[PDB]
Amino acid sequence: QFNPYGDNGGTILGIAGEDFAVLAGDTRNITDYSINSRYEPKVFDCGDNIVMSANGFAADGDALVKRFKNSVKWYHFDHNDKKLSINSAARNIQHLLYGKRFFPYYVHTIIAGLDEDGKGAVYSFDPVGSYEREQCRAGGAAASLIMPFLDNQVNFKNQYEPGTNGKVKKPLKYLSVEEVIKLVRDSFTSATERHIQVGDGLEILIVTKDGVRKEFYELKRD
Amino acid sequence: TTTLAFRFQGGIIVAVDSRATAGNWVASQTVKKVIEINPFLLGTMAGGAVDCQFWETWLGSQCRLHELREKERISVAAASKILSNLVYQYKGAGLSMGTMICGYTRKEGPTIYYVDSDGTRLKGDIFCVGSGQTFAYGVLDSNYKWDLSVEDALYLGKRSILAAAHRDAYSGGSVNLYHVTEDGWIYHGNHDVGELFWKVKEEEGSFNNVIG
Amino acid sequence: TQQPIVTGTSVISMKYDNGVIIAADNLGSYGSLLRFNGVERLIPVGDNTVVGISGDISDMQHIERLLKDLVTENAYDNPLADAEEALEPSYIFEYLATVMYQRRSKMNPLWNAIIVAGVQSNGDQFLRYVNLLGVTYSSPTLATGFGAHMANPLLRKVVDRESDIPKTTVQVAEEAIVNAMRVLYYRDARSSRNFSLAIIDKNTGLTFKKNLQVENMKWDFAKDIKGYGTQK
Amino acid sequence: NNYDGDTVTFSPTGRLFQVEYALEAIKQGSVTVGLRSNTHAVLVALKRNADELSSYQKKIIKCDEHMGLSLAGLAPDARVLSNYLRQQCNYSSLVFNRKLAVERAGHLLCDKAQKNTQSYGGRPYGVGLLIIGYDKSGAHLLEFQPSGNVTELYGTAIGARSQGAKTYLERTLDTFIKIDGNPDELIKAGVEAISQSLRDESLTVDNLSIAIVGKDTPFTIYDGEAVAKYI
Amino acid sequence: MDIILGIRVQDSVILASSKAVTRGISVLKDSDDKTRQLSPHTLMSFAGEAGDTVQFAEYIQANIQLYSIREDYELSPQAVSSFVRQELAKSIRSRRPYQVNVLIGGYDKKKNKPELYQIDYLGTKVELPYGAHGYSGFYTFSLLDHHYRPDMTTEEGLDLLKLCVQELEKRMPMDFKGVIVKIVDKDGIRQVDDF
Amino acid sequence: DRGVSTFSPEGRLFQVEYSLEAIKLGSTAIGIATKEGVVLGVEKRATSPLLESDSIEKIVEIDRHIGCAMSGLTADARSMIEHARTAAVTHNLYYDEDINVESLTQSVCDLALRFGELMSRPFGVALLIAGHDADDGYQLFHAEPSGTFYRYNAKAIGSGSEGAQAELLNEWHSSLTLKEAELLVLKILKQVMEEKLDENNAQLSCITKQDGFKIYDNEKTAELIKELKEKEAAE
Amino acid sequence: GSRRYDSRTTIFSPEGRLYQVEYALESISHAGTAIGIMASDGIVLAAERKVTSTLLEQDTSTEKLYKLNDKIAVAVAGLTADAEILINTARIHAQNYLKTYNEDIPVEILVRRLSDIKQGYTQHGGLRPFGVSFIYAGYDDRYGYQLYTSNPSGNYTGWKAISVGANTSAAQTLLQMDYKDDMKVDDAIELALKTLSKTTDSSALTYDRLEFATIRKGANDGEVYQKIFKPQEIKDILVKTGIT
Amino acid sequence: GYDRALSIFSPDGHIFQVEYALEAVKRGTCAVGVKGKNCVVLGCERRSTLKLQDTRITPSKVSKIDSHVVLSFSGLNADSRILIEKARVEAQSHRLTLEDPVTVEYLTRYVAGVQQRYTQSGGVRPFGVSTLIAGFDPRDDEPKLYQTEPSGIYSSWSAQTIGRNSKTVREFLEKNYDRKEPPATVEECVKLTVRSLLEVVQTGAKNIEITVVKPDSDIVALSSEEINQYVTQIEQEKQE
Ligand SMILES: *[C@@](C)(CO)[C@](*)(O)[C@H](Cc1ccccc1)NC(=O)[C@H](Cc1ccc(OC)cc1)NC(=O)[C@H](C)NC(=O)CN1CCOCC1
Ligand SMILES: [Mg+2]
């Protein structure tokens, strides 16, 4: 019987700083035990300082990204070139995904950018459209490997102040772009070691008020 | 999920947990399961996340249109029935929703309606809904009186979610508290179970099953 | 929902310094029966694009008709049909990718794996894959079916990343492709000896080679193998 | 007279009066000018107000990153036709990953407007359009009339007193056609052209509307303080 | 849902309907009224699939109320029962049928007679002296075969009903949280508060 | 007879031009935009003294940030308002934000030309749409049944419009306060109205960013009428 | 296009009248007179046939009186063919009500629906109205014996005695003069025939130019019987009242 | 489908089909509504050129829409049934979804919207009917009286009349109805309603219908003698 879904592997990662946000993702595309491409980008600049990635089944992912890019375009036409705020993009994407509630896009989606007060924002979606803003989210195959590391290193979970008898928690604080990129690279090298669908290359998109910058790094190709 | 809401002397208490699950994977610990439809109307969410989210935000839009057309705030009965009639149209399609529509109006007083995805709609004083409903019922029912003070009722709701957060593997994160009076709903904060459990254990002397 | 009947096996392809190469055998299998032996599975579109198709042949023939019709439609009211407004490989691909994904979305797929090989008007090499699910990807080497398992490893020893492409000549590239086609004939039970090969070069244009054969085959060592263990 | 009751009736001399009456709506419309070199295409439009308390009706509409138009006549009919164009430009991108040729844009507008001139119950569009764009064969200017007729030109103008600007362009042809790699000078030639159609009123800051598209220039619209440079 | 009974006596029709509403391992409510007044002298109890029961009852209710307003006249219990049967008979061959069983108890003012109609979700109608839906019948029918007489008073009907509820509470596996009793006679519909 | 979508020889749609005459028979509606808010006022014009004037709803809320006043065949406006409210709430559902005043007006003006041989005739009512948004601030729009809309600093529609517009031409300046604008609407209404203006046969409303769109009570307007007469006696 | 040839059947005059309904009523005014008279113990239906020819088959004929169900009948004035379309609709509507409720249809309900159909042809669809006026004679257990009339406008009213078709002005005056409330069926028969005898455009009223029906409680105990008179039976009742 | 735009604009800006529908209303029998301090009364003329009527079964002029709302009308009788039927259906639909009976203003607004839709829909003519809609909102003792008309406009009225010679009875009501002191009791309210009809009717015999609505779904139609008592009392007070 025809199975309309497939698993193209990969993994993605979003972290939000004070005045910036990163959306990272490996560049490997797979089916079963084969590598299709060592460099197939899946994190895209969608305009209005919003970067998007839809990981899982690539055909559904590309379809979604394509539709949202189109959504941004028509938002400009219909509303006097107004900027699509990150919160409005999120809600728009919920309706895109839920429009196919009974034949879903098999994708875990993440978007990153800046909120309306200029602060870094990461929104994440399930395949059918439920979303939530967080400082921190991994998605895709190695999400289960990376997410608890981020809980520990970004939100300082289970970390107490030394000598306080486990009474005073380690205080939350924003991270610099230099520190965030260290965590991204260490997260992906760790994930690459222990997950077979993750490897080849890492591509990061950084979002500030000045625009969208890219950074690339080699990963293990086995 | 565990969610509850109960009626008493001083209005309505509404308390929910904040965990999202994808099977045994913990998806989130910081999720909003209460929607503020308007200053006098609340909705709780249990079941499929987007099913609840999407259709209760939609419910809010329908309630907003009612007051534009009728120059009057929608009744709790009518708001609950819009949602129940909607899910009934989708009966069989596989929606999963366990919702409680709580609020005040002059003509009704404080009112709670349980609405689920089978199309069931029930008015009542007490409901607990979700995978941890039984755990919440156990604590709530054995400490519930009509004559509870606002302070005690707020705590009982908090303690009932905590009970379920502990025992139910698919509940946890944090307790979100609400109180609803004639003057509308009042938020009583987010309470992380990470700290709340130990605070309650110490102060109450309960949870003796655990290694303290 | 379909099941494929008459099928074509691997399509293999790679980039080199000036252009792209693509090849595919000339067999139309009917299960284990090697039913038809004169099947062309490389279909050129203009003089700057070759589309290589594997999977169900009836659906391939349908795709042939679409591409042929696409050329006609593009020429309509188009004075620059043979110049600035000629069909690009990227246009042809995206059209197919669109069709494939719509068909999978209506639970009625075109049971194929496709590789669009060509050269864009600006000289850039185009090589991209699409299949029955509407899944798309690009790489310096692409292959379908067994090709993915046996050809890609060999072709990647020549072009392992983007920076190896300017270093690779058409002589080297074609040799790797012809060697890959031999390996597939050894090891794929639904392959044939006869195949077609196409080069799309940015200087010399489209060369389409038909009626090629796998040659220089090692079989002599077979005469030494007896039994399955203890036989002498 | 007896043959102007609807679009589906020919006059005894072979005319379609409803189409001609639709053409008449364009003559009443405020003047707008189009012109191009080899590198850029420019639209200049005189905007019209209801009174001194009102805004100035917007005349220029963007269709894609590489194409847009100016209108003269019924503005809502331009909104329908521009929306259709936005969809067609978009269909070309999504399906073929291909920017829509300005010539095809013209052909599609012609065929859409024509269907309304042969069917009972419908009506012709009551608007004229000037489409500029930059595609794979360089800069382009089109003139659309609601009869269906579309024409590719170096320059033109439509609206009330458009004959003045149209003659200037016919004289100036050999000059402006070669304003390559200079946006500001091509606009100036457009602003000078439209000035041949002015009476009593002259070009002010919120009265004037300019648009440009070209080689490394997305279709952008200039209004308000951003057109003060050219008066 | 689950337990709905009906007994027709000399001058009235008595309907008894369980108060429990259950889902999973939780009794969500213990004071549920499984009935709708279709008209001043006609009452319908209902039991079956969740959601369907109320949706069906209220749909029937609206239709009968619409008729009453249009004709300024109350439809006979027989006519209402026939209307309800036809709706269920339609439903069973629909894409998704109403899975609801009902009892219609009414007093016919033209005949001065009580009437009890038992109708299942397939649209199977019968007029009976006593009726039940679900597993209830397996205990009550035989009990009533023995104890019921046609000339009984409303008070004797209630004692006969207590005898049914007692047996059910003794032998039924589920806790149905007692019943709400309603009487339908020449003076209309009224609820017994202490049962 | 003749087609509904027929052009005149002068290049205009007969049916649209005739609906414009119907609007001139309508009761007067005035709107004034300031930096502190937009004021909307209307002549109620009860046909008989037995009709309870507060039941005359000619000023209408669309959203908290957008309001509307009407003039002409006011029964035709009901569906236009219904559309506007749906468009406004729907946009908030899709985008988690307030919808722009211009975009709202454009959505309403799209309905206007959906007539012919869709509905059977153009609308016989003009609308003043007033609101606030973060991008373009306080705004006032005039929406005709031709499908056209103009932004206005101040605008009058209905029977007393040509005289009222001439008065608004002189009186409006870019530094008007809300209080001044309220008085100015009342002043111009009393001028063009047949019967003597009071709190029962005229109605005021405003929209401010802070408190949103509000219809004024009859008690509140009465004090503004008294304040207006007192200020005109004083010179 | 086709707009040129549209009469516009469903529009108002400047006076606020429906042209086509007014003209349909004018058509009906030239039709054979039909009379209905209601008594305490039954109802009479009498109707005059349109200028008969001697070669017409009189006994196997049905021009004026039609049976809707066992309890309800109608008298026609206007186009027979139009009336038959409506009659079969009415017959079906009655069987639907019986099927739905297991009770014979109340007279008014049947009358309201036929009249509602007529109304539709005056307000929408652009078709001509039905050129028919009915007299309904029926019995049910709510209101007992009932007389109604409906016309092309879709308006229906109840009556003790009523005429439709030709000379209704003359006929209504005569009925108003001699009718009284305690009247019996056999007296109502006599009144009906005497009224037609004076209003007729013919020289004299004969059996072969008449259709006649009664609805009595004349069966056995608490039940109704429809009697569509045969030609010989009309000839007898015409002698018995001294008209021939 | 028959598509013709029948209701269209004329050069002077009038919709003649809507205005001719008003002429049909003017031809209709008179109808009047008067609301008291704790009641509303609906009075209706019945033209007396029709003897031999069967008044038991002939459609009553006032129709119940729900147990708490009534509707009378002037104009085409057949048209009125279509508006009544729709209104009755919407009333039950409102009860079903909102779990509350309609307000009189809501029910009026619905009927008015239907009438309006028939003024800009193809293939149909406007309803030749104006209505008076009266009653009491759920759990409210303040009386409500509304009027609709073919154009679709609706409004509230202290007291109002429609139909033939309505300008005469409106003249009467305008001096005889004090806003400051409305008819305190039911008797007073019915008396004023009948007086206003007696200005126009002919004879206060079977020419007048009265319907009295009180709060909490308390609606009753008066009979011949009960009405005739008011007639006899008014004439005796007149001779002065
Ligand atoms: C507790 C945690 C038990 O799950 C609650 O019911 C919780 C409620 C809730 C409400 C608002 C926001 C988040 C969470 N429910 C979940 O967390 C829910 C559990 C669930 C999953 C699937 C169901 O299918 C009918 C029913 C319940 N989890 C989710 O919705 C997660 C985040 N998403 C998915 O599992 C994605 N699925 C949804 C169904 O369609 C296929 C993809
Ligand atoms: Mg490997």
CATH of the domain at H189: 3.60.20.10
Distance of CA B53 from the midpoint of ligand 1 (Å): 10
Identify the helix (H) or strand (E) that includes residue F224: helix F218-233
Number of domains in chain A: 1
**Closest by Cα among H31, H95, H41, H97 to H70:** H41
Q: What is the CATH number of the domain that holds C39?
A: 3.60.20.10
CA-based nearest distance A21→chain B, Å: 20
Q: What domains lie within chain E, and their CATH numbers?
A: 1-195 (3.60.20.10)
Residues written for chain D: 231
CA gap D132, D110 in Å, rounded: 16
Please report which ligand is nearest the Cα atom of B50. 1
Q: H–B contact (≥3 CB pairs within 8 Å)?
A: yes
CA gap E34, E156 in Å, rounded: 23
Task: Tell me if H215 sits within 8 A of H140, measured CB to CB.
Answer: yes
Best residue among B1, B31, B87, B176 to mutate for probing ligand 1, ranked by most atoms within 8 Å of CB: B1
Q: Are B91 and E51 within 8 A, CB to CB?
A: yes
Strands G161-164 and G210-216, bridge-based pairing: unpaired
Q: What is the number of other CB atoms lying within 10 angstroms of the CB of residue C166?
A: 10
> Could you identify the residue written with the tokens 């609950």?
B80
- The phi, psi pair for B96, rounded to 5°, reads -135, 105
Q: What is the number of other CB atoms lying within 10 angstroms of the CB of residue D17?
A: 19
Alpha carbon dihedral F97, F101, F103, F104, in 10-degree steps, equals 90
- The phi, psi pair for E103, rounded to 5°, reads -125, 130
CA gap A87, E192 in Å, rounded: 56
Number of domains in chain H: 1
* Chain D CB within 8 Å of residue G1 CB: yes
Q: Is A128 in the pocket of ligand 1 (CB under 6 A)?
A: yes
Residue E100 to residues E44, E59, E86, E134: CA-CA distances in angstroms? 12, 12, 13, 11
**Closest by Cα among D189, D199, D221 to D208:** D221
Token readout for D101 is 């040729």
CA gap C132, H65 in Å, rounded: 61
**Closest by Cα among E50, E62, E47, E51 to E17:** E47
Token readout for D23 is 């053409």
CA gap A85, D181 in Å, rounded: 36
CA-based nearest distance A122→chain C, Å: 27
Q: What is the CATH number of the domain that holds A207?
A: 3.60.20.10
Q: Are D86 and A66 within 8 A, CB to CB?
A: no
Residue D178 CB-half CA count within 13 A? 3
Residue G149 to residues G20, G158, G176, H58: CA-CA distances in angstroms? 19, 7, 17, 10
Q: Is B46 in the pocket of ligand 1 (CB under 6 A)?
A: yes
Q: Is A98 in the pocket of ligand 1 (CB under 6 A)?
A: no
CA-based nearest distance F82→chain H, Å: 12
**Closest by Cα among A215, A214, A211 to A49:** A211
CA gap B123, D57 in Å, rounded: 56
Best residue among A109, A126, A137 to mutate for probing ligand 1, ranked by most atoms within 8 Å of CB: A126
**Closest by Cα among B114, B109, B91 to B43:** B114
Q: Is A56 in the pocket of ligand 1 (CB under 6 A)?
A: no
D1-231 has which CATH code?
Answer: 3.60.20.10
Task: Tell me if F32 sits within 8 A of F184, measured CB to CB.
Answer: yes
Distance of CA C192 from the midpoint of ligand 2 (Å): 29
**Closest by Cα among F115, F101, F99 to F147:** F115
Question: Which DSSP letter does residue D101 get?
Answer: P
Distance of CA A33 from the midpoint of ligand 2 (Å): 8
Task: Give alpha helix (H) positions in chain D.
Answer: 17-28, 75-96, 102-115, 162-176, 183-194
CA of B96, closest atom in ligand 1:
25
Crossing angle of helices A177-194 and A143-153, rounded to 10°: 150
* Chain E CB within 8 Å of residue G109 CB: yes
Q: What is the number of other CB atoms lying within 10 angstroms of the CB of residue G217?
A: 16
Looking at beta carbons, which residues of chain G come within 8 Å of E74? none
Of G16, G125, G155, the CB nearest to H24: G16
For residue B93, say whether it is annotated as part of any ligand binding site: no
Token readout for F132 is 């606030």
Strand partners, H221: H211
Chains in contact with A, counting 3 or more C-beta pairs less than 8 Å apart as contact: B, C, D, F
Q: Residue window 23-82, chain H: list those with CB within 8 Å of chain F.
A: none
CA gap E160, E146 in Å, rounded: 11
Q: What is the CATH number of the domain that holds B132?
A: 3.60.20.10
Give residues whose Cβ lies within 5 Å of ion ligand 2. Answer: A 222
Of F50, F55, F56, the CB nearest to H177: F50
For F129, the domain range is: 1-235
Looking at beta carbons, which residues of chain F come within 8 Å of B35? none
Domain coordinates of chain G in residue numbers?
A: 1-244
Please report which ligand is nearest the Cα atom of B3. 1
For H52, the domain range is: 1-240
Looking at beta carbons, which residues of chain D come within 8 Å of A63? none
- For the purposes of burial, counting CB atoms within 10 Å of the CB of E138, is it exposed (0-12), middle (13-18) or buried (19 or more)? exposed
Looking at beta carbons, which residues of chain F come within 8 Å of A78? 103
Number of domains in chain C: 1
Chains in contact with D, counting 3 or more C-beta pairs less than 8 Å apart as contact: A, C, F, G
Please report which ligand is nearest the Cα atom of B129. 1
Token readout for D126 is 């009551």
Strand partners, D221: D211
Homologous superfamily of domain range G1-244: Aminohydrolase, N-terminal nucleophile (Ntn) domain (3.60.20.10)
Q: Concatenated DSSP letters for chain H?
A: ------S---TTS--HHHHHHHHHHHHSPPEEEEE-SS-EEEEEE--SS--SB-TTTS--SSEEEETTEEEEEEE-HHHHHHHHHHHHHHHHHHHHHHSSPPPHHHHHHHHHHHHHHTTSSTTBPPP-EEEEEEE--TT--S-EEEEE-TTS-EEEBSEEEESTTHHHHHHHHHHH--SSS---SHHHHHHHHHHHHHTTSS-SSTTEEEEEEETTTEEEE--HHHHHHHHHHHHHHH--
Q: Is B99 in the pocket of ligand 1 (CB under 6 A)?
A: no
Q: G–E contact (≥3 CB pairs within 8 Å)?
A: yes
* Chain H CB within 8 Å of residue B86 CB: no
Last residue before each break in chain D (C–N > 2.5 Å): none
Residue B65 to residues B44, F90, F208: CA-CA distances in angstroms? 21, 10, 21
**Closest by Cα among G106, H8, B144, E71 to F21:** H8
Domain coordinates of chain D in residue numbers?
A: 1-231
Strand partners, D209: D45
Looking at beta carbons, which residues of chain G come within 8 Å of E76? 103
CA gap C147, C131 in Å, rounded: 14
Q: Is B35 in the pocket of ligand 1 (CB under 6 A)?
A: no
CA-based nearest distance B105→chain F, Å: 21
Strand partners, A51: A45, A112
Question: Which DSSP letter does residue C164 get?
Answer: G
Looking at beta carbons, which residues of chain B come within 8 Å of E50? 116, 118-120
CA gap G61, G79 in Å, rounded: 16
CA gap E130, E122 in Å, rounded: 20
Q: What is the number of other CB atoms lying within 10 angstroms of the CB of residue D192?
A: 17
Residue F208 CB-half CA count within 13 A? 12
Q: Please report, in angstroms and rounded to a whole number, the separation of the first and last CA atoms in chain G.
A: 61
**Closest by Cα among G81, G79, G83, G77 to G211:** G77
Strands E130-133 and A29-31, bridge-based pairing: unpaired
CA of B22, closest atom in ligand 1:
35
**Closest by Cα among D185, D66, D88, D186 to D137:** D66
Token readout for A30 is 């797979």
Strand partners, G203: none
Strands C33-36 and C42-44, bridge-based pairing: unpaired
Of A132, A134, A144, A152, which to mutate for an interface test with B (greatest number of B Cβ within 10 Å)?
A132
Residue A81 CB-half CA count within 13 A? 7
Task: Give alpha helix (H) positions in B26-172.
Answer: 49-70, 76-89, 133-143, 150-167
For A150, the domain range is: 1-222
Number of domains in chain B: 1
Of E25, E29, E55, the CB nearest to B119: E55
Please name the residues in contact with A62: beta carbons below 8 A apart, sequence gap of 6 or more: A54, C136
- The phi, psi pair for A74, rounded to 5°, reads -75, -30
CA of B98, closest atom in ligand 1:
6
**Closest by Cα among H20, H5, H136, H134 to H72:** H134
